[PDB]
Nucleic acid binder design. Structure first.
Length: 10
DNA sequence: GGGAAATTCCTC
DNA sequence: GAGGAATTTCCC
């Protein structure tokens, strides 16, 4: 749904 | 535990 | 519709 603002996971 | 980068969400 | 701005995570 709504993905917060951040750097992708490893 | 600090500095740097990627993707996302919103406006015009 | 494309660009600009804000927030979060990773490596050493």
């Amino acid at each position: 749904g709504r993905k917060p603002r951040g750097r992708p996971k490893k």
